[PDB]
């Protein structure tokens, strides 16, 4: 079939990542113009997305060039965090650099090395202005707060960020040596609260508990089981095939009520009153499960039992056989707490400890998700805060400063590749450009003055571009782990350079 | 409806139809004679330097193109050689009478006069013809090596003909009494070395199937009883589609172990057939070879029928319809079997084939794409070495006589004419175009060279000719560039009528229309 | 004009005057960077300032006139 | 369809074979530039590997297929050189153009290139022809397994990839036999490993592990029960396949195979082989019995693999549960599942210190292309190594031989009075693409860069010093350890010139157009 040559392979390389790189641009740096996601192709929707990864897969990523940064940026946010928005823009900033060098016909080798060369030198330079805010654990808690402060920024959350700051701080604090991402348990629901993020005792659970069965339980010790039925039990008797007539199509459904009743007895051999069958039951089952005295509580969470398998000293395993196979979960009070017209069976009497369940009650499931990545990134980057107390100053205050030496380097350091390294030290400052003008400031007096203001050593001085100004990073508290700065480059660093040296595309 | 057309518009289209086709073979046929990659289908891409093959490959859209195929093909079956040139000669007059046809001048004797003209040559061709056999040595198999040398040298390697030409003789000897490609059938090899071959006069197998151990499974028999079998033995053997219900209960192990056993019978009926070396065009199975390597009787599967047939013709054996081999002639048999790797590939070689009339060649080339051109020297030489056997009367090759004849003929253009000095002149010159093409498809000059031959054809010398490699004047038979007289004889008589045929045709009827 | 890749040589001479340097500069004679000894390779300031005084203005001077108007 | 001949069919042949070389010469060498190549399948493949490009390449122009062939020839034996013969083709191809444009005949042109290639491959013989044993070769092997694995992107930090190859061809094939067995060397790789994870296995690693580790995870030396017998449904070819829905036959069946599989497993314990490899392997019901039998045994086995378990171990074949005898016992040095430190990677090495007939060189890596990168690393490394472990005959690369070859050819071209005196000298011309593209791969101006090597070869008259192949700044070949099997250039050359020569010998094209498949 097809053999593509470099020009398109390079230009399509240029356009797509640039085309996607400017999707979140005005949403990047500090907040400029936001980014509205219009979905006209697959549905009809009005959507607001400042997230690359969101924006990535929503719009068609099928541009093979876009696929690169779509992948690379996605991987980066998935690793170090909040890297997608970065990487998507960063290599997009990069593509424009060599594009001139490509236009200048600078050897593809030259731009590869020089950037990657300068990629070290800047992160090298990024290593210095990286400053430990976490030496003292309370200052580290304060380090955890400011580093989480730059993470939760720029997205859309009303009151939510305040719960996640301390929590990304607290997930680290109680765990001793890492943050709690999994010990934290994400519950995203619509409750009586248009904006809430709070701590969940045990983990809440949704159901309407009606009919005869007592709707509360006391002194719960849970028998943890993954084995059970829905309309047909898993056992020797769990299958019956009989229809000879049209009455039988009616009769075949009645014998389904035969299969539920025999397990209702089986929970009584263990005699255990608190038993999780993690598969659902209905009211008519709740009618039947209320007769025996051993209740089957339906739809028990896996991670919520893992939540319990953490603190309770119990076990999360699969299937089930007898009470000693999977250790007995225990919760002081399993209760049904009604949120709105609907009631919620709530596993409680177990509060935080080794783990956390976090129930977010938003006005929308939309507001519930944007806080997760905010949390998820603030969790990981505060786990980066753990080992490295270093926070290098945000608002691209590193970028210009990363660009400072590399500029000064590129002149000196290469006697050729300054083309790339300057271009490197050039593109680093694009992120400040797109915001500082979005800020109302003049980026020209930002990327370079404030650069040589902070790059010559006032690093707290940085972008407050939501005031349209230079701003004090430590004072603004706008800073994030030095570890969040490096790899988002290193991803984006190769995000560009791949398609740069890609000179051909074969197509089946 | 029905279509038809007459006269010059048809008649010129009659000769216009032909001249298009002869250019397919034009520069072809030789060492510097070009070669044709002809792709007549989407994934079907074919390569031949011979016309007849591509004639078979190409579409014939004309009665001319139709009437041409056999004419060239007529020289194919003869020597194995010379379609392309017969194609050249057929339409070679057609351009000479285009003066006449555009004169509109055609009494039909034009074709009728070229006939006695075709007579004076094929006569003279055999006159100057000389038996090489009883003339050369007392031996006449170094004569064949002379032919082999010369006839290994006209397409590709003259490097290896010093080694190969003696074997070309040896192949022909076992080839002669049954004239076959399969019994000179070559087995290519590569990677053990570059650019060599050696004659193996028993048969050889390119293919075989052995697993569950190989180096532990006997690969050789110093008295092979050769089962030539078309039989298949698969993972499990089945005589039934289904009966009852993969699981159930009694039914599960019931099918499986017997599905094993129905193999064992054919697994046995091979081994107690006197099949020790076992050869099955359809593959031996894995558990079959688990059995076969358990029974330590060498099996083979994925076996070439030709390999099966090369053996049955070399052993006097037979391909077998039954795993049981009652008859050692229905069976194959030898006094040697080996699985030996020449180049590293598993091969099953049979020496001790009682007939052993199948010579195999184990041949290495220079590269992937360089190998074809090599063995065609081996294949051509035999054909023409055998051709040197068949008609011992042999003249100079390389169109040596034509210029002489071209002179000798239009010598009658002085002698013949009240009229047809034209015809005799036009007849005389068309001879020269075949080697002149060979001269010119060498990118070299002919009127230069061929006339210099003619200057010594003006001496009366005839075998004076060109060695297509050097491409300069010479005496081909003294260079011993060879073809028997009958080779030159037919190509004329083949193309002569072809030049004569449709010229009687001013009209072609098509009922199907078009 | 000499037909030599300037970028490196420039960036060479850059990495020279980046480092700062006097005695060495690009020589298109050999075609590559070379000694500045005042070899003839280091050349009269008189011209340069004058030159460098001159077209330096003309830009900014003409930068005043984007306002060009024409009786044409 | 149409007849195409002469300059017509010439410029027919010229396009892709020239055009395809371009992406591959931009991919030439490690500094050769990668190519993202995306199917209509949604696939994406980033390849600076021309052999992979040609594989990835479905493009038209049958010649562009014939290179997909021609690289694979040199790919196995020589290893590296797959791409260069391609980019050398288009070199001498366009080189051939203007001689016909001169009026040098199509068969005049090819042969001038051809015999001049003889001098080249003959001049090639002058670089280093050495021959050494494996344990010496490893040094020139790993110095090349630098280049090979490295031109395959990260030899780096590996003699593990380098020196298992030193064993690979060594164990499967002798030094002197020179019979190519990469077929006997099992090149195996697994995602989820590491490039820093690479292993030689002289036997077979079977990914299937013990039914239960509660059953012994070490079977003693050999005592492997070769079993083609169902302990799960053996996809049996005879019957209509249906499971039963009734509790009646649900009970009638469950007592049935508990009897046989146990007495099968006990019959295995009776055959005296404490590992049962089963070509139709183990479901759980037989495994409880197997566990209850306390018999170490192997679950589902690939059909030919239990045979490959036979040969590679020298294992004597027990065909079927019907043939059972205690005498024939499969070979395993030690039967155990192997976690390398990569636990997601678990294979059961059948590890033969006695009879090893298939040597598994097992390499790992983070992901698919990664191990593939490492596989074609480990592939051509050994493949180049196989030459050098057999005949360690090294030319130093990057155009250092080209001038060296182009030199002698050039004058000797003029020495030949034949018309090809131009063509043979025109031959020596297109050799210069090799440092050329590499120069521009390395990002250098070739026309100067190459005559450096010329000035070198004018002085040196041998590849030792050279230009940068690795773009490292030390312009070297020997000293840059640019070390190429002297066989391969002779291979690579002969491949280019002769393929083209038939492309040059074939001027007669019946196609609907210039090119076709």
Swiss-Prot record, chain B:
One of its GO terms (cellular component) is cytoplasm. It is an enzyme of class 3 (hydrolase). ATP binds at residues 30, 82, 85, 387, 398, 488. It is found in: Cytoplasm. Mg(2+) binds at residue 81. This is T-complex protein 1 subunit eta. The keyword Transport does not apply. The gene is CCT7. It catalyses: ATP + H2O = ADP + phosphate + H(+). Gene3D superfamilies: GroEL, GroEL-like equatorial domain, TCP-1-like chaperonin intermediate domain. Signal peptide: none annotated. GO terms for molecular function: ATP binding; ATP hydrolysis activity; ATP-dependent protein folding chaperone; identical protein binding; protein folding chaperone; unfolded protein binding.
Swiss-Prot record, chain C:
It is found in: Cytoplasm. ATP binds at residues 43, 48. This is T-complex protein 1 subunit beta. It comes from Homo sapiens. Component of the chaperonin-containing T-complex (TRiC), a molecular chaperone complex that assists the folding of actin, tubulin and other proteins upon ATP hydrolysis. The TRiC complex mediates the folding of WRAP53/TCAB1, thereby regulating telomere maintenance. As part of the TRiC complex may play a role in the assembly of BBSome, a complex involved in ciliogenesis regulating transports vesicles to the cilia. It comes from the Eukaryota. Component of the chaperonin-containing T-complex (TRiC), a hexadecamer composed of two identical back-to-back stacked rings enclosing a protein folding chamber. Each ring is made up of eight different subunits: TCP1/CCT1, CCT2, CCT3, CCT4, CCT5, CCT6A/CCT6, CCT7, CCT8. Interacts with PACRG. Interacts with FLCN. Interacts with DLEC1. Interacts with SVEP1. ADP binds at residues 43, 48. Belongs to the TCP-1 chaperonin family.
UniProtKB/Swiss-Prot annotation, chain D:
It catalyses: ATP + H2O = ADP + phosphate + H(+). GO terms for cellular component: cell body; centrosome; chaperonin-containing T-complex; cytosol; extracellular exosome; microtubule. GO terms for molecular function: ATP binding; ATP hydrolysis activity; ATP-dependent protein folding chaperone; beta-tubulin binding; G-protein beta-subunit binding; mRNA 3'-UTR binding; mRNA 5'-UTR binding; protein folding chaperone. Its EC number is 3.6.1.-. Disulfide bonds: none annotated. Pfam families: Cpn60_TCP1. It is an enzyme of class 3 (hydrolase). The modification Phosphoserine is found at residues 2, 322, 515. It is found in: Cytoplasm; Cytoplasm, Cytoskeleton, Microtubule organizing center, Centrosome. GO terms for biological process: binding of sperm to zona pellucida; chaperone mediated protein folding independent of cofactor; chaperone-mediated protein folding; positive regulation of protein localization to Cajal body; positive regulation of telomerase RNA localization to Cajal body; positive regulation of telomere maintenance via telomerase; protein folding; protein stabilization. Ubiquitinated by the DCX(DCAF12) complex specifically recognizes the diglutamate (Glu-Glu) at the C-terminus, leading to its degradation. Component of the chaperonin-containing T-complex (TRiC), a hexadecamer composed of two identical back-to-back stacked rings enclosing a protein folding chamber. Each ring is made up of eight different subunits: TCP1/CCT1, CCT2, CCT3, CCT4, CCT5, CCT6A/CCT6, CCT7, CCT8. Interacts with PACRG. Interacts with DNAAF4. Interacts with DLEC1. Interacts with SPMAP2. Belongs to the TCP-1 chaperonin family. This is T-complex protein 1 subunit epsilon. It comes from Homo sapiens.
